[PDB]
Amino acid sequence: PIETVPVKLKPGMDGPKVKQWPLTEEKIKALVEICTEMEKEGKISKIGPENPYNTPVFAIKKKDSTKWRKLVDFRELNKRTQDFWEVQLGIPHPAGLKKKKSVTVLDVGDAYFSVPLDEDFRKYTAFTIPSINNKTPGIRYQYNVLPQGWKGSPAIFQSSMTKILEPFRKQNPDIVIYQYMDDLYVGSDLEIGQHRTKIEELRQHLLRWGLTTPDKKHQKEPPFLWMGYELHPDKWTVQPIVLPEKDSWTVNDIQKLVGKLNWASQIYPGIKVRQLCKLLRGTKALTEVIPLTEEAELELAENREILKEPVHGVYYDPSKDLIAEIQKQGQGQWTYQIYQEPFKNLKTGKYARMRGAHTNDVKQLTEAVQKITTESIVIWGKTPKFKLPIQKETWETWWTEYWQATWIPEWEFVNTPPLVKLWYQLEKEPIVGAETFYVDAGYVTNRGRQKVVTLTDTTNQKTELQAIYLALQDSGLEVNIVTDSQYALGIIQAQPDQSESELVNQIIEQLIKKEKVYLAWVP
Amino acid sequence: TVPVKLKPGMDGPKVKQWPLTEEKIKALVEICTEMEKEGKISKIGPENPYNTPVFAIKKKDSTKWRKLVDFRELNKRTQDFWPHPAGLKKKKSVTVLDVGDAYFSVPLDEDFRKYTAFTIPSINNKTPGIRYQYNVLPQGWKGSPAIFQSSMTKILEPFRKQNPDIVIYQYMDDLYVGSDLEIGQHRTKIEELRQHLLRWKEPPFLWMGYELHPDKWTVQPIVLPEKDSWTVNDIQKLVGKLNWASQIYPGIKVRQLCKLLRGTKALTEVIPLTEEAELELAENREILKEPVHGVYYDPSKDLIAEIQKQGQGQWTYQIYQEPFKNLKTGKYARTNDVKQLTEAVQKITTESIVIWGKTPKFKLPIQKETWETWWTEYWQATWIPEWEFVNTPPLVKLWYQ
Ligand SMILES: Cc1ccnc2c1NC(=O)c1cccnc1N2C1CC1
Numbered sequence: 001p002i003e004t005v006p007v008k009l010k011p012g013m014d015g016p017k018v019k020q021w022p023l024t025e026e027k028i029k030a031l032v033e034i035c036t037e038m039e040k041e042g043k044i045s046k047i048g049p050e051n052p053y054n055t056p057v058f059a060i061k062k063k064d065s066t067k068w069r070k071l072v073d074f075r076e077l078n079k080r081t082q083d084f085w086e087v088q089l090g091i092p093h094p095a096g097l098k099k100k101k102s103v104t105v106l107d108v109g110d111a112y113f114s115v116p117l118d119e120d121f122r123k124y125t126a127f128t129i130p131s132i133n134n135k136t137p138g139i140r141y142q143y144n145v146l147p148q149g150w151k152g153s154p155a156i157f158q159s160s161m162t163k164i165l166e167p168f169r170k171q172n173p174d175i176v177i178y179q180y181m182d183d184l185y186v187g188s189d190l191e192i193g194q195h196r197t198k199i200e201e202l203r204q205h206l207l208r209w210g211l212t213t214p215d216k217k218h219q220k221e222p223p224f225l226w227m228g229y230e231l232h233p234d235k236w237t238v239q240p241i242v243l244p245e246k247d248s249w250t251v252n253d254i255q256k257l258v259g260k261l262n263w264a265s266q267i268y269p270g271i272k273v274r275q276l277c278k279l280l281r282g283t284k285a286l287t288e289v290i291p292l293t294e295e296a297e298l299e300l301a302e303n304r305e306i307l308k309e310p311v312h313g314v315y316y317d318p319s320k321d322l323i324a325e326i327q328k329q330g331q332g333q334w335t336y337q338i339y340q341e342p343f344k345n346l347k348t349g350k351y352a353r354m355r356g357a358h359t360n361d362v363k364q365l366t367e368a369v370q371k372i373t374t375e376s377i378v379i380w381g382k383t384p385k386f387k388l389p390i391q392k393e394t395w396e397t398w399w400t401e402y403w404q405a406t407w408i409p410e411w412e413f414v415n416t417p418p419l420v421k422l423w424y425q426l427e428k429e430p431i432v433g434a435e436t437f438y439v440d441a442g443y444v445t446n447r448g449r450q451k452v453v454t455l456t457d458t459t460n461q462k463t464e465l466q467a468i469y470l471a472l473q474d475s476g477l478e479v480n481i482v483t484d485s486q487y488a489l490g491i492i493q494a495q496p497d498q499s500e501s502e503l504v505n506q507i508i509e510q511l512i513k514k515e516k517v518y519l520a521w522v523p
Numbered sequence: 524t525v526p527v528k529l530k531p532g533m534d535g536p537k538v539k540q541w542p543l544t545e546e547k548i549k550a551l552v553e554i555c556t557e558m559e560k561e562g563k564i565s566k567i568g569p570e571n572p573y574n575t576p577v578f579a580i581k582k583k584d585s586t587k588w589r590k591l592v593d594f595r596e597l598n599k600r601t602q603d604f605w606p607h608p609a610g611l612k613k614k615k616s617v618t619v620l621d622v623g624d625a626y627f628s629v630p631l632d633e634d635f636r637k638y639t640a641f642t643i644p645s646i647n648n649k650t651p652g653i654r655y656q657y658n659v660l661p662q663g664w665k666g667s668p669a670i671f672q673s674s675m676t677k678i679l680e681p682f683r684k685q686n687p688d689i690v691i692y693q694y695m696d697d698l699y700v701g702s703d704l705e706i707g708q709h710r711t712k713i714e715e716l717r718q719h720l721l722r723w724k725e726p727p728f729l730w731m732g733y734e735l736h737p738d739k740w741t742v743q744p745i746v747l748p749e750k751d752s753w754t755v756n757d758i759q760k761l762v763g764k765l766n767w768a769s770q771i772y773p774g775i776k777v778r779q780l781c782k783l784l785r786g787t788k789a790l791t792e793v794i795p796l797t798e799e800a801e802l803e804l805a806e807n808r809e810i811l812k813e814p815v816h817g818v819y820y821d822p823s824k825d826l827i828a829e830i831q832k833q834g835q836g837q838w839t840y841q842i843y844q845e846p847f848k849n850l851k852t853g854k855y856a857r858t859n860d861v862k863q864l865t866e867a868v869q870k871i872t873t874e875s876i877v878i879w880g881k882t883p884k885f886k887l888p889i890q891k892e893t894w895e896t897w898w899t900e901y902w903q904a905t906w907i908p909e910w911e912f913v914n915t916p917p918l919v920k921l922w923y924q
């Protein structure tokens with residue numbers, strides 16, 4: 001029998017003392033039947049009237065017959081129980097698995113029911129069964145095993161399972177086993193017959209510890225539906241997504257669809273939600289009906305089509321390299337695909353995240369690369385060799401001019417438009433014969449010129465970019481600009497190609513136009 | 524074993540483990556597997572909710588991997604224990620030895636062991652991940668050097684009296700051996716230590732097995748452009764910079780330079796410097812030749828280290844406690860951005876350790892995800908300074924060079 005894990009109540013706290021609520025004689029009966037049985041199987045044990053602790057229990061009728069199910073409420077005991085090493089918080093991504101010939105899933109019944117509970121802790125699991133007799137005292141028990149609903153059960157159960165699988169795993173290095181709550185996925189490259197046989201060996205091993213699982217006739221067969229995916233032994237996808245067909249969409253519908261569409265983009269390349277997303281602007285209620293714009297309709301129809309023919313994801317082949325490829329799919333929009341075999345995707349995806357109010361494609365692309373790198377380490381434990389639509393020289397250039405440090409692993413240029421580049425660059429030195437504008441809501445040029453404007457509904461730092469803006473307009477191809485604003489400077493110095501505020505974008509336009517622009521700062 | 528405790532009221536660390544590469548994981552598995560065989564660590568169960576992050580780093584001039592446990596959180600939560608050689612910095616040359624292994628021969632208070640829990644993750648969450656806790660004193664823990672100080676004095680007793688010409692300082696897992704002797708006669712007195720330390724798995728040399736030469740560690744004054752002709756622009760940059768350094772050296776004047784710049788002139792227009800002005804500049808130059816007076820090290824204040832990228836593989840830093848009140852300033856030069864930044868941080872930490880005996884708090888110019896992703900690839904120190912990530916402005920950087 002498996003080792004006992006030492007449990008304790010949180011510091012200073014004492015066990016639960018919650019009175020058992022009134023129970024119908026019909027429930028009193030069914031419980032005593034369920035409990036008396038549990039006492040025979042050793043799962044619980046009658047205790048002396050010395051135990052001041054108690055946890056209420058009541059009965060539920062599992063929609064079947066009249067037979068009742070026992071439910072013990074451990075909220076209080078849970079509040080008073082120590083924290084355990086958090087159960088499996090992370091999960092595997094299908095794209096990180098290696099294909100198998102056969103994969104078998106097994107359900108484990110009476111999981112907690114077959115695992116010891118630390119002796120010094122059982123006295124806190126004390127509960128009571130009100131006797132039907134009026135003058136008579138009800139019967140009080142305590143648990144001898146992991147109780148359903150208790151805080152540490154999930155963790156202590158997994159820990160045990162892992163120790164129970166240890167041997168079987170060493171004797172069978174060729175078999176892969178994934179534990180997920182009460183299921184066990186077991187895969188191998190064994191011939192059909194051999195596989196089924198091993199599965200039977202495992203079943204016996206688990207049964208030796210009183211762990212019951214389903215036989216061949218009752219086991220679920222691939223593909224398996226897990227965490228939103230549809231899994232086969234050789235390929236994976238996301239479970240079937242159906243785009244509603246209608247003409248009256250509410251904010252609720254749009255949000256659910258965009259959510260659904262998002263999940264799909266990890267395998268279906270080309271999914272777009274830009275237009276659909278715009279429908280949510282200024283919405284007043286979840287039930288407010290929003291008409292689909294001609295472009296939203298276009299978008300929905302295209303997704304509908306991409307989703308019509310299922311695409312599958314191939315599994316990881318650790319013998320081959322991971323290739324990551326990125327494409328700019330619109331302003332602030334990127335898409336990527338990770339594969340090993342030319343064009344046979346393990347997974348795809350898109351990046352639309354914008355870090356900071358202003359930015360350029362070079363930054364965004366670099367961030368996409370970081371995000372993909374992080375992700376790959378999690379799924380495959382190594383970084384992919386990148387295929388990027390940016391030339392070495394372009395990158396290397398922005399690299400040195402940016403104050404912040406960064407790094408991009410192995411990567412080769414890929415001449416696949418649109419290529420990312422810098423739309424403009426500030427001179428490193430003032431221009432000769434290029435007029436000089438001194439801005440401060442107006443400006444004064446060295447050649448005598450000037451202009452002052454008044455601005456309503458404007459922020460202090462917004463009037464600063466206005467001036468700079470004005471100057472770019474009235475100036476010629478080459479222009480030197482002097483300002484006191486460190487803010488504007490920073491913004492422009494970062495050479496953004498896209499922004500949130502129109503102002504900046506209008507400035508960027510001017511900037512892209514000029515032959516030579518130099519910006520300076522003065523206090 | 525000594526009864527160690529966490530600072531009152533405080534509970535153990537529960538730090539998230541940053542995803543690792545299959546390479547650093549394989550390494551940590553091989554390593555921890557062996558530490559288990561030698562009873563240094565033990566597998567633990569779910570009843571232990573604590574966690575400290577671990578990494579695998581490469582050893583310089585060795586093919587082996589080092590296990591780096593980030594006990595930073597645990598160390599802030601460990602109780603305080605109750606001297607720094609003002610002369611170690613004066614010494615001409617200092618060698619750094621990794622004496623971390625000395626600890627592996629000392630049990631850890633049974634009731635503290637739980638606080639040293641760490642996890643060896645698995646790729647893509649295939650499996651729950653291997654959990655351990657320490658049985659002996661863990662390398663990197665604030666308590667280890669302390670709880671071993673005695674046994675360490677008792678051991679550095681003979682070499683101390685044998686060679687009272689070479690000052691020996693210990694910091695966490697590192698030992699700083701300082702002298703003035705000749706490089707050969709020095710490196711020789713070092714090896715004589717390595718044999719006297721082995722006398723009680725040899726303590727390798729950190730930092731290339733090389734010396735540091737603490738004497739040369741210079742403060743880098745603020746510099747002003749020395750030019751032939753001065754354009755309106757040059758002067759404007761001159762004043763802005765002067766104005767800034769005026770905050771520190773109040774004797775700086777620009778009044779006379781601001782005169783060359785009256786009206787609205789062309790940025791490129793060359794301006795001869797009036798007599799009055801030329802003299803005021805020469806004077807400002809004189810003032811910046813040395814660090815501002817009255818800036819002392821407060822042992823009760825945290826040391827801050829700020830780094831700026833100059834480009835072309837060149838960085839600049841400043842160690843202070845109060846704004847502008849710099850205790851030190853330096854530069855570093857060549858790899859890639861991250862590799863350099865990491866090599867910098869460690870350099871500044873070693874110095875900060877040597878000069879004051881405590882690691883500084885860095886303010887790094889990089890995205891956390893980028894840093895978290897690559898730093899372990901070039902890190903070689905046994906310690907890990909505290910750090911945060913920032914966005915340096917164009918001007919500050921523009922005022923160093
Ligand atoms: C849900 C899950 C999580 C982790 N691994 C797997 C699975 N399920 C599978 O069906 C699967 C499919 C293909 C390869 N490995 C798989 N398995 C491994 C166990 C054989």
Ligand SMILES: [Mg+2]
Pocket residue numbers: 438439440482483484522
């Ligand atoms: Mg001005």
